[PDB]
Amino acid sequence: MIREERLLKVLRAPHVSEKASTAMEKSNTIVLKVAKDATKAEIKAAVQKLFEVEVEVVNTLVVKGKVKRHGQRIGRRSDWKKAYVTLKEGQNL
Amino acid sequence: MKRTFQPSVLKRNRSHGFRARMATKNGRQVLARRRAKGRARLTVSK
Amino acid sequence: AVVKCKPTSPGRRHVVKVVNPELHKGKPFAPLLEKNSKSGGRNNNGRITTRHIGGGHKQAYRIVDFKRNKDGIPAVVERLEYDPNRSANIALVLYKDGERRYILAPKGLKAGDQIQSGVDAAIKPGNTLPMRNIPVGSTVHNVEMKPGKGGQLARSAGTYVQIVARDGAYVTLRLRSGEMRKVEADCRATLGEVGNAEHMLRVLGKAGAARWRGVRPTVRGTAMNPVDHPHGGGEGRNFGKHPVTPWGVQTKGKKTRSNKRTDKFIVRRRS
RNA sequence: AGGACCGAACCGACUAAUGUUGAAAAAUUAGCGGAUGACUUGUGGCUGGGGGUGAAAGGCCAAUCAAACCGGGAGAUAGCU
RNA sequence: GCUCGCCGGAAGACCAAGGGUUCCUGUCCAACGUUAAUCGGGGCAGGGUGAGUCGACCCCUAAGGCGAGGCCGAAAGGCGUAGUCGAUGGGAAACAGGUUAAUAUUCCUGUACUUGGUGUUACUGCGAAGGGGGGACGGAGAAGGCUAUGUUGGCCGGGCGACGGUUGUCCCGGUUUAAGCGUGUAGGCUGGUUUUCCAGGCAAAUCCGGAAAAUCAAGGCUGAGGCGUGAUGACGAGGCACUACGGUGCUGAAGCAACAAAUGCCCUGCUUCCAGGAAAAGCCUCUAAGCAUCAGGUAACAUCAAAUCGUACCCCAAACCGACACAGGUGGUCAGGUAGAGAAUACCAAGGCGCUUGAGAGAACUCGGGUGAAGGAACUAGGCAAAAUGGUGCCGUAACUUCGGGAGAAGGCACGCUGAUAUGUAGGUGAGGUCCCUCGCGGAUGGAGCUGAAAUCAGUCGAAGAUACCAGCUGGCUGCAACUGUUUAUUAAAAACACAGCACUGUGCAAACACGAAAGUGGACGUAUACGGUGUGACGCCUGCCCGGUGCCGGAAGGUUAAU
């Protein structure tokens, strides 16, 4: 499920928002941006080694990047992958 | 009333798609001409 | 039995139908069925090559034994069935060794009767053997044109062939067309007539009925415009053509047989 | 039982008014015909231009088809305006 | 915020297709919005789409596509074998509740299920690209059992009324609970078990098929719903606290019965007909090559795994197709109350809306409606348009007829409400009780309660009882086409096309014919009771004469006659 070079590249950033803050208070779940091609297993291992906490389950979705016009031309933001990573009850960080 | 364009992505891609152009000598010439013209979109794609 | 319908509606008044209570109700013998793909009369170019074909009921194909060469092993008729693929009926026969087959149902044949094929089978309706061993004068059906190739002649309901002569390695047959034809005597034939002669007494009674059978409308040439058919248009009803095919060939009277390769088996043409 | 009867959905399109720089490049309202059948409809497939398809009207083949559309021969030719 | 009005088999809700951020929140208003705009599907920023069991992918095939070699073709290419793709069809498994500003069968709570790997343990013949089974199949119709759902009663909470009455036979509301698990019911199909033998199932078979004995009468398979459990729970009017007045918290009564009842389910059934109604895999079983103390198979418990992509929002439309925030077009699903045959229609519920210029005025004329003295087709090409008819039941109904029809011919009578028969009837449903029982979801008996049309008699209100919406005008002579159908999408629906029926004519199967320089294919897995072409056009009574012309069929002697 892992090789350390890959695990280090798989988690990109914390994602911040009311939904993500609540998901932590209410459900001990942390919300992340992960590599696009990341799999739930990679995400789980990665979180477990690097942030050194135990993982219950990982859920993931893919966000479509918004388009923005510009007179006659469009620009397009990038799709990315969101990960809802639930920590085990004995909460950490 | 009912108009002539009734969409279907599946049928769009099967008639006009990249792979359909590539399947015949003449469709591959459609792509050649388009590339020579320097078109941004060779075919309607994803 | 052929039965007239009462005129409880105009499309029923003229219906006359062939109803045969000897025929199995419900489903055929599954192991002898194949798929049957409708064509609309179009060929492998997608073009209509034979007109007027289309729609009509779905049909499974029954595997009929035209060769009848399970020699020596007797068999009994279990039941007669309806076959949508042909005007004749068929019999489900059971061989002594457990095998089942379908055969064309000859006239008179019925559940219980015993059939058999081979160079020595009894001369009896439903039995098959090379015509060199069927007495001249007899009446046969499902006749082979080449040895072991399978029956091709006189299969349609009510049809039959008569062996009028045998000489050398060939028999001479009076086909149902009236034609006198030579076929080599090792060809197989089945004693009897094909069953269901009352077939030709049906009256469809309405247009829908021909549609159920996959026959689409014929449009008369004279009812078209010149560009479409040599039979042209006119101005009111007009004709004045010599009558032709849509393709400009003389319909009515022009012979179109042209096969020097087989001329020599034809003793006398139909009249 | 029935290409049966009356009648919504569904399919059609006989009459009239309106509209005609329209609400609409063919409709709306009131009525009308078929409605278990040769019915109707979704998805996908096949047939290609002197060619298709046509229960046949020269109908239909992407809003003008007695020969589609696009590109080319191409600045066709025009004793005409 | 209070009222008013509109839709309500939709103008509500939910899918698919198609779109693609239009979704939620903040902020802004130039342009877009047919007006203003603080508002918006507009600008800007930020947020938002969470799955083993919902879909895709995946396994399987249909039409059809592609196609190693191959057949064919000046080249390009056409066709096609093995194969390989291709859903609109087949194939494992999840439900109720709670939650966000915005997702949820995806998060949470509760309760489940499926198929694989690994281990342990007991038992064991395992093995496929093959055999066999199964999957697996039409139309119509009948009607019994059910559920969804509703109605009333009961139960529980609350109410005592802005104006006469309202502690009662009164008013309002609620009375909801899934998958899974257990039970095997109404009902559907079918005899069961053993042994022996065999020209079939490409070899093999313990399986299928066939044959022969023996033996028991009950065996097995399928199966809605109910009941139980799930549920010690969830949901639940309301209550009590707080509140930034948007909310949040805690708590929480009854939660039953009878009757009615689908177009949903039993039902892939049953009955019946002719037009005779996919494939392949998953699945069950059989063996072959093999493997034999291994492997593998079956089971229980344990343990691991179930990736990836979609998931926001619009969806009969302001977000899709229509250049528009366009009266058009767009497949599927759901089906509450009263009246009603109804999915028609009217009024309502849930839910959604008043259609993005308004204010006045109350001329002609135009559009769309209502009423109309006397007359009543005098209008006009023409009753064009209007007006009229319009339900149910019973009585009654001509010529003609192919005996079905014509026929709803025509015409007539009844029709509300109240009481009696009967404080609710015929019928439908069915409890307690009693008794039997191969004891159950059983049978008999019993008739309580519930529900309930229709008739007659008597009475009674109005001008009017099928009172609204809804809902045939009828009859006589005659041309044409038998009929139902089809057609000029967009000025013609007809007498035109088709049609069953009839005739002529070709066609012996490598058929004629047709698409193709060909290969290949349709005809047809058909075979003269068949297939093609042509004309006629139900049926009835019938279909006469002409072969000179033109067309076609047959002929061999003579003349003429090509390349050579």
Ligand SMILES: [Mg+2]
């Ligand atoms: Mg996901």
Ligand SMILES: [Mg+2]
């Ligand atoms: Mg014409």
Ligand SMILES: [Mg+2]
């Ligand atoms: Mg000629």
Ligand SMILES: [Mg+2]
């Ligand atoms: Mg009808």
Ligand SMILES: [Mg+2]
């Ligand atoms: Mg209309």
Ligand SMILES: [Mg+2]
């Ligand atoms: Mg009707």
Ligand SMILES: [Mg+2]
């Ligand atoms: Mg299509």
Ligand SMILES: [Mg+2]
């Ligand atoms: Mg030139």
Ligand SMILES: [Mg+2]
């Ligand atoms: Mg010029």
Ligand SMILES: [Mg+2]
């Ligand atoms: Mg935008």
Ligand SMILES: [Mg+2]
């Ligand atoms: Mg918004």
Ligand SMILES: [Mg+2]
């Ligand atoms: Mg403005």
Ligand SMILES: [Mg+2]
């Ligand atoms: Mg916006």
Ligand SMILES: [Mg+2]
């Ligand atoms: Mg989860």
Ligand SMILES: [Mg+2]
């Ligand atoms: Mg090919």
Ligand SMILES: [Mg+2]
């Ligand atoms: Mg090749």
